[PDB]
Amino acid sequence: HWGYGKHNGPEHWHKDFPIAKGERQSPVDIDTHTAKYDPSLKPLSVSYDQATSLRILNNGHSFQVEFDDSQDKAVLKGGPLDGTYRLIQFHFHWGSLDGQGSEHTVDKKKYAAELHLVHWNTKYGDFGKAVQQPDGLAVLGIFLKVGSAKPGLQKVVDVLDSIKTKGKSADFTNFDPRGLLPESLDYWTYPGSLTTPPLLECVTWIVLKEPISVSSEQVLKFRKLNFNGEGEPEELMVDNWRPAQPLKNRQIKASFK
Ligand SMILES: NS(=O)(=O)c1nnc(-c2ccccc2Cl)s1
Ligand SMILES: [Zn+2]
C-alpha cells in the first residue's frame, strides 16, 4: 500500500497508478518570472460564513477536517472557475524540518507546510462524480511559514492528541475556516491533479501568493501524529508531501502583477 516511506513513497506510485506519469500532474514549481499575468482573471469569491465543520480524522497519511457539503453552505466561486464549488474538507502536508513540507514550491523555495481546501463542482451532483471530470475539483493551496502563531489554527492543534493514530476521529464542530486565510487573495492558477492516489487529473489549482505564518510550537504538534494504527509500531507522520512534477504543456497564470 502506497505511502511516503522509502519502499512505498511517491517514486513507487506509478506502479499501481500509472496516471502518476501523466500530463497534468501536481504539484509543480511555480516559476514566478515565467507565470503569465492574466487580467481576464477575476477575484476569488470565498463564502465560508455558513460553513459547518463536522469531524476531524487521522486517515493514515494526513488529518482531514470534514464539512457538511449536502448544501451550498461553504462555497468557492470566481477566480478561474465557472460555477459553484462546495467545500468538503481541508488537510495539510508538512515536513520533518521547517525547510520542507510544502508540495508546491515558489522559485524552488519550499515552505514548512501547505494547507489544501478541497472543493467540488456542484454541477456533477456528488464528489465521486466530480473526480471523474477535468473541471471537477478546485483546491485552494495556502503556504505555511514558521514565524508568529496563527490563533485561528490553535483549535485544530489542540485536538490532534485525540486522533494520534490512523483511523481515529473526533467530533469537530463550529470551526470557522476563515481564520486560516491570508490577508490578500492574490493567486496563481494552473490545471493539475490530486497529489495523492488516485492522482486523478480533475483539479483546478488555486495557489495563494501570500503565506500564513504559524509558530514553531504549532507545527511541532503536527509532527507528533502517527501514520500507524493504535497498537502498531510508531511511525511519525512527517514529510507527507509529493515532490514537484514536470509542468509539461501547461501555463501557470497569475491574478496579479
Ligand atoms: N492533496 S490534494 O488536495 O490534491 C488531494 N489529493 N487527494 C485527495 C483525495 C483523494 C481521495 C479522496 C478524497 C480526496 Cl479529497 S485531496
Ligand atoms: Zn493535499
Side-chain angles (χ1 to χ4, degrees), residues 61-63 91-97 100-102 112-114 219 222-225 237-241:
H61 52 88
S62 111
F63 57 93
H91 61 267
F92 301 78
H93 307 261
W94 59 96
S96 47
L97 301 144
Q100 59 190 234
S102 70
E114 187 174 328
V219 175
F222 286 18
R223 298 182 181 131
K224 295 175 145 37
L225 294 163
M237 190 180 276
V238 292
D239 290 319
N240 55 351
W241 50 280

Side-chain angles (χ1 to χ4, degrees), residues 21 43 46 60 62 69 82 102 120-121 133 144 168 216 222:
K21 306 212 184 274
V46 182
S62 111
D69 65 344
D82 292 276
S102 70
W120 59 274
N121 191 334
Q133 306 297 333
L144 277 67
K168 294 296 141 97
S216 64
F222 286 18

Side-chain angles (χ1 to χ4, degrees), residues 131-152:
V131 296
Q132 297 195 27
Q133 306 297 333
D135 57 351
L137 298 203
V139 177
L140 204 57
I142 296 156
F143 293 121
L144 277 67
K145 64 185 176 45
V146 172
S148 33
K150 190 84 158 161

Side-chain angles (χ1 to χ4, degrees), residues 35-228:
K36 165 94 164 139
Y37 168 60
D38 178 355
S40 77
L41 284 169
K42 258 98 248 53
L44 285 175
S45 176
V46 182
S47 306
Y48 285 171
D49 53 88
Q50 296 296 138
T52 296
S53 60
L54 291 175
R55 196 171 70 142
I56 181 165
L57 165 74
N58 179 341
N59 65 8
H61 52 88
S62 111
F63 57 93
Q64 279 15 242
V65 171
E66 298 166 343
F67 286 83
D68 171 16
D69 65 344
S70 65
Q71 310 174 81
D72 277 2
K73 278 219 121 207
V75 304
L76 179 69
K77 57 199 291 83
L81 302 181
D82 292 276
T84 300
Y85 293 64
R86 251 173 232 174
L87 180 65
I88 174 176
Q89 54 116 296
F90 67 79
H91 61 267
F92 301 78
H93 307 261
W94 59 96
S96 47
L97 301 144
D98 300 335
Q100 59 190 234
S102 70
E103 299 208 296
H104 290 86
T105 57
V106 181
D107 299 322
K108 315 235 116 128
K109 173 188 183 160
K110 293 176 175 83
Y111 284 91
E114 187 174 328
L115 168 58
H116 286 161
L117 292 120
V118 178
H119 311 67
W120 59 274
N121 191 334
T122 61
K123 81 146 81 131
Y124 300 117
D126 66 71
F127 180 89
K129 304 290 192 305
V131 296
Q132 297 195 27
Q133 306 297 333
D135 57 351
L137 298 203
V139 177
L140 204 57
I142 296 156
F143 293 121
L144 277 67
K145 64 185 176 45
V146 172
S148 33
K150 190 84 158 161
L153 172 75
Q154 199 58 35
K155 266 189 248 28
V156 170
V157 159
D158 277 334
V159 64
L160 299 179
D161 258 7
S162 63
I163 56 142
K164 182 178 161 204
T165 49
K166 177 177 51 192
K168 294 296 141 97
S169 69
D171 307 309
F172 197 65
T173 60
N174 302 106
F175 181 79
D176 178 354
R178 290 178 294 176
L180 303 174
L181 301 173
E183 174 185 315
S184 159
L185 294 190
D186 287 353
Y187 62 93
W188 294 288
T189 183
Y190 74 98
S193 79
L194 308 174
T195 66
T196 66
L199 302 172
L200 302 176
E201 302 184 325
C202 59
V203 177
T204 50
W205 277 99
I206 301 170
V207 175
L208 297 189
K209 179 184 45 196
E210 170 181 337
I212 55 159
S213 72
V214 302
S215 277
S216 64
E217 288 77 8
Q218 292 184 309
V219 175
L220 268 13
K221 298 211 172 161
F222 286 18
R223 298 182 181 131
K224 295 175 145 37
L225 294 163
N226 279 175
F227 285 126
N228 54 285

